[PDB]
Design a protein around this ligand. Structure first.
Ligand SMILES: O=S(=O)(c1ccccc1Cl)N(Cc1ccccc1)[C@H]1CNC[C@@H]1N(Cc1ccccc1)S(=O)(=O)c1ccccc1Cl
Ligand SMILES: [Cl-]
Ligand SMILES: [Cl-]
Ligand SMILES: [Cl-]
Lengths: 99, 99
């Protein structure tokens, strides 16, 4: 699909058997989701920008589906204000910027 | 052009006659640049980030060139981790996401 930027590029995703709404973010190196439970081991990490930094848990090799497109990659879980799908997963679905 | 996301989508912009490196951020509603001098009056604005809200300066109707494409719009100035071209200007240059 071709997504306009007149509005925030919000799409539906399926992760951990759950359906959530997330922002396709090209400025994000990583994928960050609001508090939730995920399988496997994790390690602490800090991500920051406008407003400062927040602490999150890093889970690797997590299965996720963005708009029907299945992808695998690292997912960070923490007190983010909005679900974010970063470049690490955007590439897996073949997403690109065009103008 | 078509821009993949394997690495940060950094491009060259021109503002106030100076060239700068900026990040194409679809996760950003607005365009935020590092501290710099801009003409005219400015108004206050609150922007939300990964770590919370902060106050930045808002300059309206500012000329700026992104990847050779000319645009004229709102530019916010504040302590951003990197220069960011948000949706407000990404739309002016006809940018969309595709996969
Ligand atoms: O928070 S920002 O400064 C911002 C800028 C302009 C307008 C609004 C905001 Cl919130 N920012 C840019 C940034 C930060 C740090 C390094 C490089 C760029 C956002 C915008 N998109 C990527 C960034 N994030 C995702 C995001 C957070 C909150 C709301 C929308 C999107 S993030 O979490 O800070 C993040 C930083 C580092 C690694 C992964 C992630 Cl995912
Ligand atoms: Cl990854
Ligand atoms: Cl590719
Ligand atoms: Cl604008």
């Amino acid at each position: 699909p071709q997504i306009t930027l007149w509005q925030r590029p919000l799409v539906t995703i399926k992760i951990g058997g759950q359906l959530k709404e997330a922002l396709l973010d090209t400025g994000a190196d990583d994928t960050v989701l609001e508090e939730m439970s995920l399988p496997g081991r994790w390690k602490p990490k800090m991500i920051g920008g406008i407003g400062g930094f927040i602490k999150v848990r890093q889970y690797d090799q997590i299965l996720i589906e963005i708009c029907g497109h299945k992808a695998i990659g690292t997912v960070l879980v923490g007190p983010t204000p909005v679900n974010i799908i970063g470049r690490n997963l955007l590439t897996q679905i073949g997403c690109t910027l065009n103008f």
